[PDB]
Structure formats: C-alpha cells, structure tokens
Design a protein around this ligand. Structure first.
Ligand code: NAD
Ligand code: NAD
Lengths: 487, 488
C-alpha cells in the first residue's frame, strides 16, 4: 500500500503526473500515486521482454508451482484483498470476497485448460512421428476494468503466465490500489523479476502501452468502444495477437413461470447484482405482454424496491454498493432522464441515495414501443420491453449488435431449446441468472462483445500458439523415390 | 465438361464482369474462358449464401457430415480427372496432383474429429447448475483460394466451415478458376443445398468486392503476406467479422552432422524444390555448417539437384516438378536471382528457363553467405544458401526473418533439434523429415507475417465455430441461502 510502480522486480514512483483513487461514497482519497510515463512504459515492456527469455524456458511444472504459490497467498490474504476491492470500488464485502474466491478458482481450471487446449501430444502418423507442443507469445499487455479489478485481470494473467508469457499489467485508473496489492502478491509469491510489470495510469499510459512497438500480445477487458478503438489501431498488424472482451446489451426472457418469487429472484440477480455492474448483467428484460407479465412485473418491482444499498462495509451487508464514481451515477440519472422524455415510463425510479455519492437505487423503466439507443452501460437501470408472440421475443433479444449473454426463465424447455437454436450470444442461460458464469467453460462474446477470442477456459487458446513437428530420427531415403530423382 | 459459369443459389450463370481466361503455364493455349463476377454478382452470392445459412445451420451435425462424406465419395470417384485438371491448369506433374486430390479426400474425417474435439457438445454438473457447451457457425464466410494448391487449401477451409454449419462464397485464384468450377460441380453432384456454396470467379476487382462486402460474417484467406496484411488492415475496427489469415514464409532448413549424405540431400531437395518450390512450407533458405562437411554436402546437393527433371504436367515419364504458374512470374524469379548475383551472391546452380515463353524453371541454388538480401517470400525453385559457424549462429539466422511458417533440421543429433524447437519461432518444425508434407492431423499456423493466429489444418475447426456455454437449471426457484437484502 504505497502507490508505486513495479518494473523488473523493483518498486519505483512513476514519472507521470500524479493521480488518486477516491472511494465512491466517502469521497476521501483511497490511493495516491504517479502514473507511468512513456519511457516508464518502454521500461516495463523492455524488462518483460528480457524476463521472457528466461521465463519461457522454465518448465510448465515450475510456472505452475509459482502460480499455485500465488493461490496459497490468495487464501492467506483473502479478507484483506476483499476489503481492498470493496473499499476502492464500492462493491459490498460479501461480493468482493466472491471476486477473490473467483481469482483463486481461476488457477486449477487454467491448468486443466492449458493441458487440453494447448497441451503436449505425441502420435505416430503417415509422415513420420508427429509431435505437438504449444509456445508462449511473449510480452502481453493486460488491461483491467474497474468492476472486477481482481477476477478479470487475473483471468488474463494466470493463463498467460502459465503458458510462458510475461505480462505488463495496466489496471484501470479507478482501481489502481487493488492492482498494486495483486502485484505485491505475485512478488511475495516468488515470481521472477520482470515476469510481471505494473504500469499505473489513465488514458495516456494505456495509449503509450498499446502503441508500443515491442509488445507481442494485448489482452483487453473493457468497454466495446475502446476495444474497437484498439482493434482499429492494430489494423494491418496480424503479428500481435489481440483478445477483446467487451460488454453487451444482454436480454433476459421470463415467460410462463410457475414459481413467481423464483423468477423474481433470478431476475434481480441478473439485472442488479454488483449494482448492475457485472458485464453479464441483463440490461433488457422481456416479459410477455398482458396479464401474465403484469403479475410478474408487479412482484418484481415489489421485491426490487426492497433491495438495500449502502457502503461496501455496512454493519448489515447490503445487496449492492455504490457505482464506481459519483459522476457515473450522474450520467446514469441523466440516462434514464433521456429515456423517460423519449417516451418511456418509470416502473421503479432510480434514486440517488446520498448527496454526492455513487449510491443509486434500483431503476426499472418500460419503453415497450419506444426506440432508445443500442448502448451498453453499468448501473441498476433496467429497460423492460413487452412482447406479443414468443417469436417476437426472439426478434427482440437479437435486436442488438452486442452478443455477450442472454437467457430465459421458463418452465418450458422448448422455449430454451428454440432460444439456443436462434439466439446469437456468448453465454445463454435457462433458469439461472445471467450473472455468475462458469470459468470451467468458455466466455466469449459475439458481435461487438469480442473479436472471437473467448476467454475463461478458452483463455488458454489465446495465450499459447501451436508448434507441430514431423520427427524422424535419421534423414534417409524413402523406399520408393519420386520421379526425376537420381542418385 | 466445363463451362466457365459462375454458380449462385444452385444455378449456373455467366458472370456480368469483364471476360478473362485461364492459360496453361507451359502450353500457352487457353484452358478456361469465363466472365468474372461483377459487383452485383458478388452481392447476389453473399445475399443467397446468407439466405441459405438460416436453413443450413439448423441441419443436424450428422446430416451435414453425411453430405460432406458424399463429397468424399465423389472425390475418390473422379480422382484422376481432377488430378488432370490441377496438373493441366497449374503445371504441376500428375503424380503429385493425384496427391493433392488424396489430400482433399483425407481432409474430411480429420475435419470431423477436429470438429468434435475443438468445437463439440459437452455437458457437466458444476456449482452454478447443469452446464452445457455447444458450438455455433458464424454465417457467411468468404473463402479465398491460392493457385499452388487450388484444391487442397480451399478445401481445407471449406470442409471445416460447411461441417460447422457455415455457408461459403468461394472466390478462387484468377489463375486456377477451372479447378474451382470443377470442384463446385463436385459439391453440387454431392447434394449440397442451393446457396450453401457459391462460386464467384474473377481477379483482383472481384475479390475486393467480396472482401469489402458489408454482409460477410467471416473471411478465410490463404495467400501472400502482402495481400493478407491488406485484408487485415481493411477489417481494422470490425472484430465482428472473424478473419483467418494463412500466409507465406522465409522458411529455414538446417543440415548439420548427418551421417547419411544422400538422405539429407533427399530431404533438402524435397523441402526446397518439390512442386517447383511452390509449397508454402518450402525451405527458401538452406543453412550448412561452414567448412569441409558442408562443402561435401552442398557438393552432393548440387550434383543431384542438377539431375532434376522438369517438363509438362503430363510428361511421358513423369518429371519431379513441372512449370511455375505463369511465364511472367518465372520472369520475376529470373530477375530475382539476377539481383542476388549482382547483389554479391555467387551462383551454385543457375536457374534457367527451360523453354522460351513458359514457366519451366530449372532448379536454382545461390550462396549469399555474407550478403544481405530482403526478408521476402517467393514461390519458385530458387534456393538461397547461408553458411554458418557456431550452431547458435545457425539459430541466429533461422529467426532472421519476420515470417514464421516452417523450419526444420536435418541432423543425427537430437539435441540440435531440441535447441531448435526451444528457440525457433515458426509454425511447423520438422526433424529429419522434409519441410513439405505437413500433417493435416495437427494444426498448421504460421507466426509473424505468416498468419494472425487462426491456424488452419487441424485447428481449422476453431475459426469455423464460436462457443456458446449455458448454465441450465430446469426451474427458476430461490436458492437455499438468499443474498443479503432480498425480502419475499
Ligand atoms: N466483457 C467483459 O467481461 C466486461 C467486463 C467488464 C466490463 N465490461 C464493459 O466495460 C464497461 C465499463 O468499462 P471499463 O471501465 O470496465 O473498461 P475501460 O473502458 O475503462 O478500459 C479499461 C482501462 O483501459 C485504459 N484505457 C482507457 N482508455 C484507453 C485508451 N484510449 N487506450 C488504451 N487504454 C485505455 C484505462 O485503464 C481503462 O480504465 C462495462 O460497463 C461493460 O460495458 C465488459
Ligand atoms: N499460407 C500458406 O499456406 C500459403 C499457401 C500458398 C501460398 N502462400 C504464399 O502466398 C504467395 C502466393 O500466393 P498467391 O499469389 O496465390 O496469393 P494472391 O495474392 O494471389 O491471393 C489469391 C487471390 O486473391 C485475389 N486477390 C488479389 N488481390 C486481392 C485483394 N486485393 N483483395 C481480395 N482478393 C484479392 C486473387 O484471386 C488472388 O490471386 C507466396 O508468398 C506463397 O509462398 C502461402
């Protein structure tokens, strides 16, 4: 807890302009530090490149041993890291600890994924004795969001390091402290010098890193906007492997449910967990028009009003905490303000709970006939649309260029079956909230939610490239020569 | 038996573009005549492939597999006729064109196993419920085909794509349109629904109209790192369209400490001169240890290399290699080794034009040990040799290229190979076997300027299907322990 930078195993103040991380509700300063400058970034990259040569040579077993030690250190400091996350983001403790346990779980699963997606295989084939092994890329710049400053960046870092990569981690300028803590835990775990390198900063720092001509890969978790910016930047440079993980305008369907409070439960999970700040949250809820939906939305609004929202560490733990900043909340309020005047009516008003904080109350808005923008956004603002035929519901679900998550809450399996059949989305759930993905299976958005480099399990796919060999043992003539060959 | 028509939505139709023709590389006579697809022709192909996708993606995996297997039946059934088309239109000798066909046939079952492993259907019980994983096709994929293997490579994209439920708008090389039309007719006679594959002949203009078309959902490419980079630059900012690039390489072959001379000379000639050196995995640069051993080796290598025959694809006794794709290309190769010799290099074996205005080139070997030539890819039987001192200097040379397709070593000492694998950055790396003759059973993806990390061959299945993972439950109902702040 110092505010430094980290390069080649050494902690050093940044040469860039200082910035600070403020707590979303208290407003006081939680972090102070210097942002990485241009030459600072050149240093991080040069030293990760240097460390690569020695790190790529470590066996898979050794790299796994260091990473696992990192996991043991995660368990040992679970509460302190949880408290750091919740403190700096506004997420409640009970949820931050969830993010930590997720970081821990990302390890063994990343191991199995490495061994299946990019393992070592040996076989006898027609052209001789074929063998297949997987090689790391080199220096991968990892960008971290602010909603999960521990789970997601980790989900890039573990698979990459394990496979022999070296990392230049640039966290969000809204969650630098959690980043510094995680880096210290990699140090205290015995990670060779320069194998991971921390570069704090904001937009300028990320600019200097992304354009840097010596990175060998870039792994991104963040807004579809900046993700597309990066993808355009690398236009014409296929040599640098890019992984883009972006948002979505995720739809949730709830039709013909026999357990009301159950569907209200899973719905509230999907739309409001993490203050609606989980990238897999449902931003659009679809309910069959008429009487049945009226009953459902009645109960859903009833229970949603009952949700508590307070500081990350309130004596009785609330359901959700603050939004990252008071400004973000301001833009959300202006957002639903633009929705209402567009023609929508408020089923449940999104309210600012304390004077100049990011504490927002749940918000539900009906714009069934209205046409708002296809735009992603974090916050507890849920747009609801009422539909006639189910074949119309499927039309609505796909009514977005994003393609991350989508699912249906229903007792009828065939609604799910036809959903899976028709929907164009990354993860599509039935009777479980859109949130809470499984790291044991891929996690890759389609459309504007990724560039077809799915992470989580298939993370192992974009951390290592394949080397295939036809081994012989002795260069010697075939039984029957080809035409035109005389000896 | 051929026509020269385009093929869209199951219908054969003359193209609306300007006419062109496919010439035999040595005979000079016309082998194909047809109209290239125009802008609206391509818009039609794409629109109709998109329409057909909706119906094709819903077929089960088994049914699509059955149609493709029927395609295999037809490949075996017409093996010799398709071989003759390939050899005729490219100049490749018959005996190896027959190989290209057998490779097309083999690309099927392996594409199946690949689909079931890399993008299958799996189910497991996990913490968040009963999780399931299935793999979906992208949609309309534009497939561009080379000219060295107008059958094997395009197929290596098409089978994996069709099988996974994609539809294809195939644009073949304007140097091998006939092979394309014939192959398409073979897909027709195989029962492929209308619009699931759509042939769009043409040259640069046609391919541009296809790549720029705002309705493709993927682009699969095999061709020069030059045009490949052009395409990649084009899609800059469009991650929604999945792109796979398969590009060339400045492939190095090292031969040090071989106790069987004629064997290593064999594998060398295979790697550098097979198919007139027009296989993308050919060794463009041979590395031989400085001094006596390399002197003897290269001596033998030139002796035997001179003994190579080169003639028409249908020579009475089949030669080792045929003509290069065109006489003009050959012209640029001659200009190439001329620029190397005047650059400071010495000619170990002169590349000569065997007939006046043809693509018949004789093997060419050039020593440029001290000279610095361009890091550039090129097809042709022109082999540059580099002599090295320490083995770590040989490794220094191998990576002396921005391309990263193939590389291998001819040696009796396994540890030289081990140090190669450890250090070399290339897609496929062979030991004591020719650089040519890859294995469709294992991935095939070049690094650096040889691809964008969407390797084909076995891993083709990865860029033909995207993953959908689901947490199924059965009934939306409250958990045992609620979250804090939820009242009912
Ligand atoms: N796909 C996912 O799993 C996932 C996860 C989290 C968030 N999201 C999406 O992201 C939205 C919020 O954005 P966010 O804050 O998480 O990510 P972001 O846009 O802030 O990007 C992460 C970091 O990259 C750096 N950066 C900013 N500008 C840059 C630039 N121009 N060039 C290089 N680096 C730059 C900053 O550190 C920035 O905070 C969410 O509401 C949701 O839409 C998606
Ligand atoms: N990666 C591999 O496996 C592989 C395979 C074969 C050849 N190669 C290499 O590629 C080169 C030979 O390939 P080639 O000359 O057939 O490639 P190419 O550039 O001719 O590409 C094939 C076809 O694409 C079309 N085309 C041309 N310009 C286009 C454009 N601007 N936009 C869209 N389409 C366009 C034309 O039909 C062209 O002939 C050599 O470097 C060779 O070694 C690599």
């Amino acid at each position: 807890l110092t505010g430094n930078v980290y390069i080649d195993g050494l902690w050093l103040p940044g040469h860039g302009a200082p910035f600070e991380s403020v707590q979303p509700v208290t407003g006081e300063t939680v972090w102070d530090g210097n942002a990485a400058s241009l030459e600072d970034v050149d240093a991080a990259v040069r030293e990760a490149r240097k460390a690569f040569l020695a790190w790529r040579r470590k066996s898979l077993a050794e790299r796994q041993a260091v990473i696992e030690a990192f996991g043991e250190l995660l368990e040992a400091n679970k509460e302190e890291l949880a408290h750091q996350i919740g403190l700096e983001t506004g997420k409640p403790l009970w949820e931050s600890r969830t993010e930590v346990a997720a970081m821990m779980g990302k390890i063994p699963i990343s191991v199995k994924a490495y061994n299946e997606r990019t393992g070592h295989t040996e076989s006898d084939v027609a052209g001789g004795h074929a063998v297949l092994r997987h090689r790391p890329h080199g220096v991968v710049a990892v960008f971290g969001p602010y909603n999960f400053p521990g789970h997601l960046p980790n989900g890039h870092i573990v698979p990459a390091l394990l496979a022999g990569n070296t990392v230049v981690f640039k966290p969000s300028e809204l969650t630098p402290g959690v980043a510094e803590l995680t880096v210290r835990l990699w140090e205290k775990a015995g990670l060779p010098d320069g194998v991971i390198n921390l570069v704090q900063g904001g937009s300028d720092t990320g600019k200097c890193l992304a354009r840097h001509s010596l990175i060998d890969g870039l792994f991104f978790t963040g807004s579809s906007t900046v993700g597309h910016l990066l993808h355009e930047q690398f236009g014409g440079q296929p040599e640098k492997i890019l992984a883009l993980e972006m948002g979505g305008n995720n739809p949730l369907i709830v039709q013909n449910v026999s357990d009301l409070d159950g569907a209200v439960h899973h719905a509230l999970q999907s739309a409001f967990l993490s203050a609606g700040q989980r990238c897999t949250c449902a931003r659009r809820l679809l309910v069959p028009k008429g009487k049945k939906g009226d009953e459902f939305l009645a109960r859903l609004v009833e229970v949603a009003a009952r949700i508590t929202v307070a500081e990350f560490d309130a004596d009785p733990q609330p359901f959700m905490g603050s939004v990252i900043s008071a400004e973000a909340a301001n833009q959300l309020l202006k957002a639903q303000a633009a929705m209402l005047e567009k023609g929508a009516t408020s089923l449940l008003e999104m309210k600012q709970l304390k004077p100049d904080t990011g504490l927002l109350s749940p918000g539900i808005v009906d714009a069934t006939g209205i046409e708002l923008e296809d735009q992603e956004f974090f916050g507890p603002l849920l747009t609801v649309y009422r539909y006639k035929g189910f074949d119309e519901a499927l039309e609505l679900a796909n009514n977005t260029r994003y393609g991350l998550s989508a699912g249906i809450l229903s007792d009828d399996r065939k609604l799910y079956n036809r959903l899976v059949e028709e929907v164009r989305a990354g993860i599509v759930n039935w009777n479980r909230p859109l949130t809470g993905a499984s790291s044991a299976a891929p996690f890759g958005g389609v459309g504007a939610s990724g560039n077809h480099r799915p992470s989580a399990y298939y993370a192992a796919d974009y951390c290592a490239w394949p080397m295939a060999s036809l081994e012989a043992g002795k260069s010697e003539l075939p039984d029957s020569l080809a035409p035109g060959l005389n000896f």
